[PDB]
Design a binder for these strands. Structure first.
Ligand SMILES: [Zn+2]
Length: 33
DNA sequence: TATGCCGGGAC
DNA sequence: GTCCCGGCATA
């Protein structure tokens, strides 16, 4: 929904700024839900 | 079109 | 251990 986890924050042009769960398309370890 | 995730795949 | 996508649930 209206949430903003790593990928919707930084985008694929800044993928290096995401958490390692987001890097691997697994449940976010940073922006908990 | 695209986030966000499990099941499956790579080395 | 460290690395990621295909297909799906979902909007
Ligand atoms: Zn994350």
């Amino acid at each position: 929904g209206d949430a903003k986890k790593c990928r919707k924050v930084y985008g694929m042009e800044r993928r290096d700024l995401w958490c390692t769960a987001c890097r691997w398309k697994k449940a976010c370890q940073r922006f908990l839900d």
